[model samples]
Target: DEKVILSNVPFIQQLPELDRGCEVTSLAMMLQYAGITVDKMKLANEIKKVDFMNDGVRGNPNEGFVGNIYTFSESGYGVYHGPLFQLAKKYLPNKAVDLTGKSIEELYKSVKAGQPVVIITNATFAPLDEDEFTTWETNNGDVSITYNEHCVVLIGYDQESVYIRDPLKDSLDVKVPREKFEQAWVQMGSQAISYVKRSK
Candidate 1:
């Protein structure tokens, strides 16, 4: 089974009010409060990858992704990773949530059991290592193509491949080889972390 989860709610809604750029620094700090340590610079770069700037309907006048959306323009910021952590903390302050050292299977199982999981990957802003590309190729099949950059959501995983929700594209669904996902997973440095929303 699979589910759809919002990946960037907090950054999108609060970027303007905070008077800050929607960079990974804010998102990383927010996730840190939930016990996850993310690579701030890397994540910020990833956010910039999909940033539509003035081209988006919101019309950021600032000219860059951050400036246009928050610093320069009146257009509201788009979704970000911070709000997901807040949402989890709100619903489950004391649930059995784990963000460190869990294998993919364990992480996937926890979410399947009804917990919401948050994972940070540097696939978008950094270069992909051979191992990460290998994992994606094996699990997603040879036909699966990997773009050079961006951040994405990991919704679920099996022995073969992992499910993802990409923010840049029109459609949110994607399945990549598990090994490939992990290879890409490790690159964002400590940014690769996952959290589960406690059951109600």
Candidate 2:
């Protein structure tokens, strides 16, 4: 078996306050695993925020976090690679890498090198239904929005499953079927972020 597992990624839960803070929480886990000292809340406060809906236009997640991250009762949503990569660079500097639009096999290369990758996927870990998505007009254009957007740290993978550390899950390296994850990941535009280990 050509299984690759990264055992060092720290675990974090985006709860007790930040109900939609999966993006930053996932980043914290990756940073801690890479030996950086940081926390989820600090990142949450510092992260760029964009209005969920402004002047009849929805904020682009690719630009910054949309709405409130503290609770779902509001129009809170998550951020994507661009903003998260920028945040990671503030801490890791030259080491942060945006693997957005790269293939899943490319992500495997990073994990094989011992770095856990942050990926956007469905919370259900499967393809979402057509009714679950809605079109929102952004400054860029009409973009699709889904309340089920979730972020997690990818730690390992085998032929059958992709092991990840979900901020909502209590366990580390939770296994999700590879097929399901890949499809969900692709559906979310194959966005991924990780860091290159600073030279020792």
TM-score top scorer: 2
Residue-by-residue lDDT tens digits, candidate 1, 80-115: 334333333443465524353556566566546543
What TM-score against the true fold does each predicted structure earn?
0.43, 0.95
Off by over 4 Å in 1: 1-91, 96-98, 124-150, 190-200
Q: Which stretches of candidate 2 lie over 4 Å from their true place?
A: none
Error (Å) of candidate 2 at residue 162 is 0.9
Candidate 2 backbone clash number? 0
For candidate 1, give the lDDT.
0.42
Candidate 2 structure quality by residue, lDDT tens digits, 1-200 = 78999877788899976989899999999988878899999999989989998998889887889999898799877898899899988888878898999999999999998988999888999999889998887898777778888999999999998899999988864898899899899998899999887742
Error of 1 at 189 (Å): 3.6
Evaluate model 1: give its TM-score: 0.43
